[PDB]
Every structure is written in structure tokens, then in C-alpha cells.
Design a protein around this ligand. Sequence first.
Ligand SMILES: NC(=O)C1=CN([C@@H]2O[C@H](COP(=O)(O)OP(=O)(O)OC[C@H]3O[C@@H](n4cnc5c(N)ncnc54)[C@H](O)[C@@H]3O)[C@@H](O)[C@H]2O)C=CC1
Ligand SMILES: NC(=O)C1=CN([C@@H]2O[C@H](COP(=O)(O)OP(=O)(O)OC[C@H]3O[C@@H](n4cnc5c(N)ncnc54)[C@H](O)[C@@H]3O)[C@@H](O)[C@H]2O)C=CC1
Ligand SMILES: NC(=O)C1=CN([C@@H]2O[C@H](COP(=O)(O)OP(=O)(O)OC[C@H]3O[C@@H](n4cnc5c(N)ncnc54)[C@H](O)[C@@H]3O)[C@@H](O)[C@H]2O)C=CC1
Ligand SMILES: NC(=O)C1=CN([C@@H]2O[C@H](COP(=O)(O)OP(=O)(O)OC[C@H]3O[C@@H](n4cnc5c(N)ncnc54)[C@H](O)[C@@H]3O)[C@@H](O)[C@H]2O)C=CC1
Ligand SMILES: NC(=O)C1=CN([C@@H]2O[C@H](COP(=O)(O)OP(=O)(O)OC[C@H]3O[C@@H](n4cnc5c(N)ncnc54)[C@H](O)[C@@H]3O)[C@@H](O)[C@H]2O)C=CC1
Lengths: 279, 275, 281, 277, 275
Amino acid sequence: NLYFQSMSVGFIGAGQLAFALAKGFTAAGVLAAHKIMASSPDMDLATVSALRKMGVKLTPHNKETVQHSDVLFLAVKPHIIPFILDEIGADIEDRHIVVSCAAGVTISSIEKKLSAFRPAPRVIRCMTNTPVVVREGATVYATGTHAQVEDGRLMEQLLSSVGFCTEVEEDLIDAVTGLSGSGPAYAFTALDALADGGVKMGLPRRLAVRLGAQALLGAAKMLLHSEQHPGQLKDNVSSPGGATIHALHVLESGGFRSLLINAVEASCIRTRELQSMAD
Amino acid sequence: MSVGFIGAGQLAFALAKGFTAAGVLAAHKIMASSPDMDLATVSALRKMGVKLTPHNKETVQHSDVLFLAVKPHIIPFILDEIGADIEDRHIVVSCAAGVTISSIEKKLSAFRPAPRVIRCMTNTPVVVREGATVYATGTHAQVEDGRLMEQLLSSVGFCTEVEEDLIDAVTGLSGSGPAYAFTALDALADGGVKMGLPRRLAVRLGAQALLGAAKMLLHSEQHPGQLKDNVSSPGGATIHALHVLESGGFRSLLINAVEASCIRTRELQSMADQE
Amino acid sequence: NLYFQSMSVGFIGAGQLAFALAKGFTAAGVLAAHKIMASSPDMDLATVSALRKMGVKLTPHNKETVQHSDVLFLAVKPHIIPFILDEIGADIEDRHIVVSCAAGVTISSIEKKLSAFRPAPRVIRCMTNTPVVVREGATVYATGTHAQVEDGRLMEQLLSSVGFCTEVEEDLIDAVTGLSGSGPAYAFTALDALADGGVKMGLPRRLAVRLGAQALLGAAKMLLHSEQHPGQLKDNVSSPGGATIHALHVLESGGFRSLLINAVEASCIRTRELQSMADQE
Amino acid sequence: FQSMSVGFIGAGQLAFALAKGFTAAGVLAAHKIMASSPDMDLATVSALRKMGVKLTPHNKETVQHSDVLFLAVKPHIIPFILDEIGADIEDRHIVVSCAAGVTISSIEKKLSAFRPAPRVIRCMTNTPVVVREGATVYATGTHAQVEDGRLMEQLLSSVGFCTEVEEDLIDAVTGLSGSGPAYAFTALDALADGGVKMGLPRRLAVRLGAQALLGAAKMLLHSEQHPGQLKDNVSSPGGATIHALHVLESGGFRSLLINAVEASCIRTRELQSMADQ
Amino acid sequence: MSVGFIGAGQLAFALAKGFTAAGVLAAHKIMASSPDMDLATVSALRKMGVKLTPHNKETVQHSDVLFLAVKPHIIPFILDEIGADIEDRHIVVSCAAGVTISSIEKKLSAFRPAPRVIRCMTNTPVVVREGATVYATGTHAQVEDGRLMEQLLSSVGFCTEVEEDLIDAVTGLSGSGPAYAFTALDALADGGVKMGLPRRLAVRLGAQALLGAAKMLLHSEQHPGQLKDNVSSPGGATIHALHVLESGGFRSLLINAVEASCIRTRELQSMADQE
Ligand SMILES: NC(=O)C1=CN([C@@H]2O[C@H](COP(=O)(O)OP(=O)(O)OC[C@H]3O[C@@H](n4cnc5c(N)ncnc54)[C@H](O)[C@@H]3O)[C@@H](O)[C@H]2O)C=CC1
Ligand SMILES: NC(=O)C1=CN([C@@H]2O[C@H](COP(=O)(O)OP(=O)(O)OC[C@H]3O[C@@H](n4cnc5c(N)ncnc54)[C@H](O)[C@@H]3O)[C@@H](O)[C@H]2O)C=CC1
Ligand SMILES: NC(=O)C1=CN([C@@H]2O[C@H](COP(=O)(O)OP(=O)(O)OC[C@H]3O[C@@H](n4cnc5c(N)ncnc54)[C@H](O)[C@@H]3O)[C@@H](O)[C@H]2O)C=CC1
Ligand SMILES: NC(=O)C1=CN([C@@H]2O[C@H](COP(=O)(O)OP(=O)(O)OC[C@H]3O[C@@H](n4cnc5c(N)ncnc54)[C@H](O)[C@@H]3O)[C@@H](O)[C@H]2O)C=CC1
Ligand SMILES: NC(=O)C1=CN([C@@H]2O[C@H](COP(=O)(O)OP(=O)(O)OC[C@H]3O[C@@H](n4cnc5c(N)ncnc54)[C@H](O)[C@@H]3O)[C@@H](O)[C@H]2O)C=CC1
């Protein structure tokens, strides 16, 4: 991997996503823990000290991170992005590749901020999720106006080391946020509820969590490796008159499917609001 | 070691495919039997190298480990057909939902005393070697019988021994669970399509998100609520979506499901035990 | 062993919050009641009657409070605040710290009014709740433009004597209002209902109120003193197949969680919406 | 509580919670407690171990050690336990059953086949004894001495509120204060979600919501006033609180908490009507 | 007669398959074009005999009847690309949902006056020659243009002329309608499976019942309520099931669907017309 030979990486914002990618990247063995830098105005958080246990260099000053970094991740709340771009924008050299992870924030807003300091800022927008921490992430990215082709290919190689990754048009990223960005939280809620179900029927809680998580993992893997439609796989499991089809009825009766549609839609719609509450 | 399957449908194919993929069993040392020797699962096992037959008696004579993978109401008819063919060497592994070790031991004890019986509940993801399997050892299962089953089935997913009275609840949880996930994924994909994603991409991303979250939980020392907290940034998109799931009673629906599947499982065995 | 010997406290407004804070400050020992003065236009209030028993000095004239006080709590309704500021703005001195407890009212609107009379007024915005009265309040505060560093430390010192207190950014305070400011009323509603349930299943009302409140108190204390997620503590009570997991299910079937999220949201939105119509007017 | 020896049959969540509370209170030396379980691998067993509690796989050893013996196993284990160690219950023992649903009557039936006057007490407590803010009730059996009830009240009062009740109230208490902490933890998790939705950091929103519930409960305990009156004092006309109370009312918030207490009480009586038959 | 398709996806395959099955068009006289000349619909048309190309201009030059079967937001880009290639001989048939005759005529009138434009709304069952199709003739459509389109499309299903302002409502009804039916059938099949039927049999019987009822209504002079009456015997099984549909507001859900699809169709065209 000549891409990652001597590449440095930095994070502005040292929160949940910064730790997850740093944990993912280092576990994948694509980068050394000391070759990554993160910043936060609060070195007192949990994420900050976990990153330090990793051996990640931590500083309070975002201008330190930009100086040390080839690829620069922006891992801060959406409304901070233009505040950060004012602060470090005169420090963005032509060598930098600025990868924005903030939900909603458009390539255009970032480029307008940085194109006032140097004409051709190299910007990539990305939407990832926390399972990169076990190298099973789901990632999309869109390339900006001045991103060279090697920048898209480096980004793919880097983010494929921690999970699935593909390029998309930027107009899809809000919807991806609602689906795979927020998706893991839908899954954690589901697994907690399924374990409550297991407990209600007599199972020890530890066992019920394990069995629920394994069933969801196995089922998602089955879908990824099958050519068959989701409903065909459901049919394979649903014996006539059986326990499973009886359970599927009660899911249907509460509008189970519509709740997951509602969830993707509400996250996507909130992601658009977060962007226009910047423009 | 020689393994047999009575019933050559969905579950037989999943386990045999997983065993052979795992490298713990060679397809030629596996024999499976079914009457309608024309079903699609039959052909899938035949293109796989499994030995096939319409005679349940030939499967018994060929195997040391004998899986029962027929619909639960068929188990008694099978135990009658082959009960006289069971030898000392056999381990009988019932995969049937609801069917008790007691009921199997009572039908097979009329032919030879001390049948070695194991009850398991598994699920279809054994096909990709990510199944969830529990098992209970029967009255006459020796020590090496439970250790062998756990070794064999650990090769196609998670596997642990349980007291038999947990198994109907496991059935509602990890037995039916993949169908809950398949439903969830079809719906998440519809959500992704509603918001502008192509179906193909939406299916892939939804499935990858469920898999990754599941792997995270399994590999973490943390409560699923705590992992939920990390994803849901303050004022953010995730916590907005979580609210609409809560407003629908999302959690209660999953509790309802596990319960309904467990209760149906007991109900079915009750009708079996009534006769 | 805290005590502010050179500090005189005043309250403009002598209703629920002022009584709650005066009662808590005095029970904490940090403030003798006679070093506290409160003012209200209705000297025949139950709260004014209560404050009089504690020894607090009472007056109808707000200027009197301002002239006596160093730390000046604005404890009137949000829409009264601009009239209060117009009346006593010319009486604010350098020595004053103005602590606004009004829901929604920004530091900016207070500072703009008072800056017309004397530049650089020292303003602190505060969100607290009634349990300060038993010294278990939840308080956040934000420091204004001209508040010294010792002003915030002093206010955190003082408000810490009656419960939890921390500094926050001002743009979090409307959300705190939705959670801990309105939070006691959610709890009172919950305890009335749980007691109703205890009565339905055959408990005497008095016992059912006691047990319910003790259960909420103990659980909240457990969470405050644990490093564990609330779901984990919940799991320790929910024995497999037991009574508790059966009750959790019916709570889940009603959307219990979403109602509490709805409540926090509704209180915060209303807090923003009151302020925004004050700003226009 | 001079030199009392305490035992728990069952080394699970409640056994840990009470042992933690009693040693926190300083009423018991950890090493004067003995707990038994057939699975010495559990996390509760490791925590008890680190506390200094004596652990053993043999229930008979717990019994011989104890003066006060707590039964802290699942309700349906209780008859298996009494069969097993029933011949080892001595006249000096006070047997305290913590199991939801199990009646004094059913315990005395099993035990009096061995000695004629087993001293039995039934209680319902909850996990906040761990921070000495438990809510505990107890009822005295046929042969419990007057001193036995006073001893038990003194012991349980050191880790929270404790009062004697008639036994016919204990299933209802189970639904209220026994299961109550779980309802509170659910409430707190949801209040924090709401705080996060409106823009608070998770840690701060957990802290403030917990502080709010604790302070409100304490207010009501120290007030001679109806909880509706206290609610009135919080909600200013046209204000934020009264808007939030409305959306709670529109979802039937009150009725859900009533359904909860009722469902847990009814389940508790089912956990006994199954054992009895 | 030579027919062309710009866009070679779901709808192009359905219509071409139906036309050739019908015998009104030979596959070799049909040309279709797409950029991603790799999609599965592309291969299905290639195994069919349709002529294929990545150049939209070649489709125009080859056809007399030119169908537009691209996603609605692509229509303007296409009208720009080929507007200069349109000749007097062409009939332009837009299949795009929402897209108005006005908007197409305005883009093509900038190159040659009086373009012959037809707007239709069709659906996927044209693939089995049972589609539902309406059409509106444009400003410069001669008389033989509307009669030709009706002849061509009557061969793959029902076809009638409508005023253009009904077409967005038709889209919510018969355009999206097959998806409502597919959903209904998956669910009826689940119902059949819950009550003991094998999935395969349940799918077949459900689909046959919907088809037969639909044919009955189309071939009867009677109100659908009256046909409902004949099936529901007094005290019987049908009227019990109808009650549970009514208690769920079954009818209102279908009204909601048609409305939601119609409204989304107008909304989308509004965003198009805004720019
Ligand atoms: N948490 C998740 O699962 C995902 C989050 N994201 C995005 O990542 C960004 C952060 O997500 P989280 O890490 O969850 O937020 P987080 O708040 O845990 O981390 C954000 C960090 O930024 C720090 N920060 C605040 N002001 C700063 C400043 N002026 N300069 C530098 N650092 C500053 C804060 O101290 C905080 O720790 C958001 O934009 C979110 O949309 C994207 C994908 C998934
Ligand atoms: N499909 C699933 O998701 C799971 C299934 N199981 C259990 O495994 C068993 C079957 O599961 P599936 O394979 O899904 O059912 P299936 O219907 O695919 O397999 C049934 C097989 O039994 C065969 N059969 C019928 N009568 C027979 C006889 N007299 N002798 C021999 N074979 C006979 C049929 O020909 C068919 O091949 C059931 O007891 C079910 O509870 C366990 C857990 C999950
Ligand atoms: N009660 C609560 O739970 C909390 C109250 N607050 C805030 O504190 C303020 C008041 O709280 P409450 O005491 O509940 O209101 P309250 O209505 O109980 O007392 C209000 C006081 O304002 C007095 N007042 C009216 N006009 C006045 C004037 N021109 N000059 C002086 N006093 C005047 C009234 O006579 C009364 O004594 C409000 O802004 C409220 O948002 C904040 C947190 C919690
Ligand atoms: N956890 C709670 O919040 C409360 C529980 N209780 C009651 O306390 C009892 C247990 O509560 P948890 O500790 O939650 O159960 P738990 O399941 O956490 O612990 C149960 C203990 O019993 C042990 N055990 C199993 N068989 C045994 C045997 N034959 N001999 C000795 N020990 C054996 C288990 O290994 C485990 O250590 C139940 O009856 C429950 O109703 C009462 C009030 C509150
Ligand atoms: N699928 C259905 O049920 C019905 C579809 N329609 C309409 O027909 C049109 C397409 O329907 P589908 O075929 O389902 O969409 P589809 O996505 O299957 O076909 C779209 C085709 O457009 C092609 N395309 C994209 N850009 C192009 C360009 N610049 N030049 C040429 N071809 C290009 C794509 O490669 C793809 O083959 C839409 O306007 C839709 O409203 C009408 C009624 C029902």
C-alpha cells in the first residue's frame, strides 16, 4: 500500500467518531497510533483519554493538527465547521486533503470558506459510522471540485481498510446518513429490546444479548452474500403455522416496517436542516 | 466421522453447507434423506457432494451423528420408523423446534435403553458460518457427547450449552431472529429508497450497518444503550430518528415478537404432547 | 464550612423560586436570613408569609432590594423582567452581580437594558429548580460579557450549597430548562401515578406515596453514584421471567420513553418560543 | 449489631446489593457474611469476593455459618432450597426470604417438617440498598419473636426505609418499590435522550435528569403536600413546564405507570400460583 | 414502423417485451439507448433482439416513434441533447411521470416549430400485455397520431385518451397500483402461511384470487360493492374477514396511497418547473 507509506492523518475534534476511525485505522494496521493527531478544546473527555491510551498525539490547538497532517478529518459538530474553517483556513496548504465527516455540511460551503485563502482546496465529504472500530464500517464519500483522482483512490483504500466504502454523488449523502450513518443506533436499540424479550421469556440477560446480536450479525451477513431478495430469505425461515410467522405478524401489526422508514426519513431530513442551519 | 440428516430441506442445506465450508466435514461423509427427492434443497445438496437417498433407514445406517431436521410434527413418525435401527454408536441430535428430549427419549427407549439424545436450536445463518446455536444434553448423553456437539457446531457460529427449559425462549430470540432482521432490512432499504438511494446501494448499506453494529456489540464490554449514546450526537440526525422509533413503540414490537414466537413454540409442543 | 460573611443577597420577586433558594441557602448555613432581602408587589403572598418566618427582610420596593443587595436574583416571570430592568436599571452599581433565573431570558437582552444606564453590568444567567429547597437542586449558569472570573466562581460556590451546579454555554440553557428545570413536575406526575397504581393493587395511599418516592430517590442516587449506564442498572433489577420485566414491557407498549422525550422537547421549544416573542415585543 | 453472622443462599444481584449496603453502613463486617451459589463464575460472585464476603458452593455451609439467613434465589428455586437445607435450620436461625411472591406459609410448611417452630420473615427490598436508600417492607411469620421483627427492622433500616406490613401487601409493594428502580432507570434513560435531542451532551443530560428525579423525590418525602400541589408550584401559567405536562397527559403517561405497578404485582402473584400447584 | 427508446431500464424492457410478444413490433425494428450499457435491463433487451447503443442520437435517427423512458429529472437534459435531431416524422412519446406536455414542447420548439408530442402514463404489467395506459395528445399532434398511439398501446393492455390534467392522478392509481398489489400479495401469502399453507401454494392462490376478482369486475356491469355482497355469505367466513379489514381502516389506507402518489407526482414536477 504505497498510499499509506508515509501519510500522516489528523482529526479536528477528538470525540466519538475521531476515536472510532483512529481505533479502526490502527487495528487495520494501515497507520501507526503515533502518526495520528487529534484536537479538542476539552482534554478532559472520555474519548480524549482513550485516544491517549492508544498512543495518539493529542493537542488543544487545531493549528497543530493541520500542520502535522496530510489527510485532515473534520470530526466536530456541524455548526462548528465554519468556525473551524475560519480558524485553520489560512493554514490549509495545497498539500492537504480535507475530509469532512460532519453530518449535512456540503462540499460547497467548505470550499467557499477555504477557496478564499488558497484557490484549489482539496475537499472530500464523507459519511461513515462507528463500526469502523471493528473494521465493519459503512462509508460513502463524494469528491470535491479540486480533488485529484489519486485523492479519491487514496480515500477509497483508506476507508476500505475499516469496512465497506464506495464513491457516491454528494446529493445522496444525506440519505446515506439516515440509513447507515444512524443505522448502528437503530441496531443497538433493536438488540436491547430483543434482549428484553429474551429476558421476559426466561433467558439470562447476558445470553439474550449474545444470541440477539449473533442472530442479527448472521442475518446481515446472509443478505450480503445472497443474491436473493430480503423477503425470499424471510420466506425460507417462515415455516407454515410456525413460531416465526406468528412473530412476524405481531411486528406487522405494530407497523414495524414503517417505523424504520420513518427513522431513515427523520435522520435524512434532520441532516438537511443541519446544513441549511449553516447556509 | 459420519453425519446424517433426516429431512433434506432448508435447515439440512444450511448446516451441511456450513460444515463443509468450515472444513470440519467432507461432503461425501454426509448423507441426507427426504421423500420428495425433487425439492430444490435436495438439488442444492446434490450439487454440493452430499450423499442423498429417499430411505431414512440408509441415513441411520451410514451416520454416527444423526441430525433430525424435519418439521416438528414429523418427528414422532420418524422416531417410529428408525427407532429400531438406532445403535449404541449414534448420537441423535434433534433440531425440531419445541420437541422435548423427554418425548424423543420415550419413543426411542421402547427399542433400546439409554438412547444418546441432544436437543439443539440453531438458525439459518450457519450457512455463512455465523449461526447462533444452543443445545441441551439428554439423560444418557455421555460427557464427550456434549463436547463433540459443541465443537462441531462452534465451527458454524456461536454455540453454548443451556438447560433445556431455556430452549423455547431461545427459539423466539435467535431462532426466529433472522426473519426479524430480514424484515428490518427490507424496510430500512425502502426508507433509503424513499430518500433518494438506489435500491441496490440501500440494501448493501443497511445490511452492512446491521452487521457492523452487531459485531461492535459482540466485541465490546459495553451495554447496547451506551453504544447507542456514542452514535447519537447532541441535536443530531440519529437522536431525531431514535425519537420516531420510540414514538412508534419500536422496542415493544421486538419484545412482542420474541414472546409470540416463544409462546407459539410451547403451544405447538403442547398439541404434540396432548397426543 | 462555607460562609459569605461580606455578601448580602436580594430577590426581586418573592414567589416559589425565591422562597426555595432562600430556604435552601439558610438551611445550608451559607447565609443568615437577615442578610437576605426580598421584594414583591403582593406583600400578602403565602411565599412572602413563609419568608417572613425564616427572618428574611421583606419590602414592596424593588429599589430597596437593589440598594441592600450585592448579589441580586431576578426571580420574576420572564415577561416581568424588562419592566424590572427599566425600574432599577439606574440603581445598579459596579458592585452588583445580577443573577437572572427567568426561563428563556437571554444575557443579551438583560445586558442591553442595563447598559443604557451604566456600562458593563455584571450579569449571570441561571436555570435552577425547586428541589434547592431540600438542597438537592440542579443548577446551570452562564456568565455574561462583563462578569469577572470571581463572579462565576462565587455563584457556583453559592449555588453548589443547595445542590448540583455547573457552568454551561448559554445556548444550552433552554434545553436544561426542558430537562432539569421542568423535570421535578414530571417526577411529581410520575409519583402521583405510581401511587395510584399502588392503591389499585391494594396499598394504603400514604404507604404507596412513601414507597414510590423512596424508589425514585434511591434509583436516581444509584445512577448518580454509578459509572454504569442506566440500561445496565435496569438489567440488574429485571430478573429473567420476573415481575419487573413484565412491567417494563407494558411501559414499552405505551411508548413511555417517547413521552418523556416529547416532554423535554416541548418544554424547551416553549422556552425558545417565549423568548423569541419577547424579543419582537 | 454485635457480631452477627449473615448468610445469603444465592449470590446474585440482590445478595450483592444487600451485602454491599450492609458493609457500607458499617453494620456488618464483609467477612461475617457468607454467600453460596452453584456457579462461582458469576460477576456478582467476583464482586462479593473482592468485597471480602465468604463464598462457597455449598448451601449447608452458608446455613451453618449464619444467624440471619437470607434466601436470595429465584422464586421457583425456593422449594428446592428448603428441601435441601431444611434439616440444617436450627432454632437459633432467622430465615429471611427475599424471593418475590413466595409466601411465608409455603416456607413454614417446608421447614416445620424438620424443626417445629421455624422463625420466618418475608421481605421485599430493592437494589438501592446498595447506596443505603432502599425501600424495604417485611412481614413476620408464625414463630418469629417480637425481637425478630425489631432486629430485622434495625438491620434493614441501615440501608434505607424499612417498615412492617401485613403479608397480603407485599405483592403490591413488589410492583411499586420492588420494580420501581427499573421504571426510574427507563425514565432517566429517556429523559437524557430528550436532553440530547435538544442539544445537551449525554453525560450532562444524564447528570441533570438524575439530579432532577432525586431532588423531586426528596422534596415529596420532606413535604406534607400532595404531589399535584408540588407540580402546581413548578408550572407557571402559559409556561414551559405546563406545555410539557400536556404532552405527557396526551400520551396517557399516568396510566402507563399504573399499568406497570399492576403488571408487576399480577406477575408476582402468578409466580406464586405456579409454585403452589 | 420503427420505434426507439431513450432510457433502457425497467419501463423500456416492459414495453418492448410486450410489443414483441403482441406481434405489433419486431424486435429488430426497435432501438434502445442508455449510458451505463451494462445494466441488467440492457442485457434483457439484448437477448430479446432489440438493437442497442450508448448514443441517444442514433436512437432518434432510427425511429419514427420515440419513447422517452428516463427518470423524470433527466428529461430536460435529453430534450437538449436531441432536440436538434427531431424531424417532421417523429412522434415523441414521454413516459416520464409528472413531466408536462408544455415543458417538452417548450424545449423542443426552440429547435423546430410544432413538435408532435404525446404524454402517456403506463405501468409495468405491459410486460404480460395487461397494462393500464392513458395518454394526452399535445398541441401539434395530428389526428392520426392519437389513433396510432392508442392502437400500439392497446396491444399491451387497456388504453384510452385523457385530458392531460388527469394524468398525475392516474399515476397515483394505475401507475403505482402494481406496487400496492405486490405488497398486498406478499401479505396475503404471509397470512396463508400463518394459517398452515406452504408459501408457494399461498402465493399462487393469492395471486389467482386477485386476478380473478379483477377480471370479474372488469367484465361485469355491477358495482364492486355488489360483487363483494355475493361473496360474503350470511354469518360466514368472508364477512368476518371483511370486518377486520374495516376495523383497520383498510379502505382509507388505499385512498391515502393514491393521494400520496398523486401529490408526490405534482410536487416533483413543481420542483422541475421551478427551474
Ligand atoms: N458519532 C457518530 O456515530 C457519527 C458522527 N459523525 C459526525 O462527526 C461529528 C462529531 O460526531 P461526534 O464525534 O459524535 O461528536 P462528539 O461531540 O462526540 O465529538 C465532537 C468533539 O468536538 C470537540 N470540539 C468542540 N468544539 C471544538 C472546536 N471549536 N474545535 C475542535 N474540537 C471541538 C468537542 O469537545 C467534542 O468532543 C459530527 O459532525 C457528526 O455529524 C459522523 C458519522 C457518525
Ligand atoms: N428454517 C429455519 O429457519 C429453522 C428450522 N428449524 C427446524 O428444522 C426443521 C426443518 O426446518 P426446515 O428445514 O426449514 O423445514 P423444511 O420443510 O425445509 O425441511 C423439511 C424436510 O422434511 C422432509 N420430510 C417430510 N416428511 C419426511 C419424512 N417422513 N422422512 C424424511 N424427511 C421428511 C421434507 O421433504 C423436507 O425436505 C423443523 O423442525 C424446524 O423447526 C430450526 C431452526 C430454524
Ligand atoms: N418555579 C420553578 O419551578 C422555577 C422558576 N424559575 C423562574 O423563576 C421566575 C419565577 O419563578 P416562580 O417564583 O415560580 O414565579 P412565582 O410567580 O411563584 O413568583 C413570582 C413573583 O414575581 C413577583 N412579581 C411580579 N411583578 C413584580 C415586580 N414588578 N417586581 C417584583 N416582584 C414582582 C410576584 O409578586 C411573585 O412574588 C420565573 O421567571 C421562572 O421562569 C426557574 C426555574 C424553576
Ligand atoms: N434484583 C432485584 O432487583 C430484586 C430481586 N429480588 C428477589 O431476589 C431473588 C434473586 O434476585 P436476583 O439476585 O435478581 O437473582 P439473580 O439470578 O441475579 O441471582 C440468583 C442467584 O441464585 C443462584 N442460585 C441458583 N440456584 C441455586 C441453588 N440451588 N442454591 C443456591 N444458589 C442458587 C444463582 O446462581 C444466582 O447467584 C429473586 O427471588 C427476586 O425476586 C427481590 C427484590 C429486588
Ligand atoms: N418502473 C415503473 O413502474 C414505471 C416507470 N415510468 C417512468 O419511466 C421512466 C423510467 O422508468 P424506469 O425505467 O423504472 O427507470 P429505470 O431507472 O429503470 O430506467 C432509467 C434508465 O435511464 C437511463 N439513463 C439515465 N441517464 C440517461 C441519459 N442521459 N440518456 C439515456 N438514458 C439515460 C439509465 O441508464 C436507465 O437505464 C421514469 O420517468 C418513470 O417515471 C412510468 C410508469 C411506471
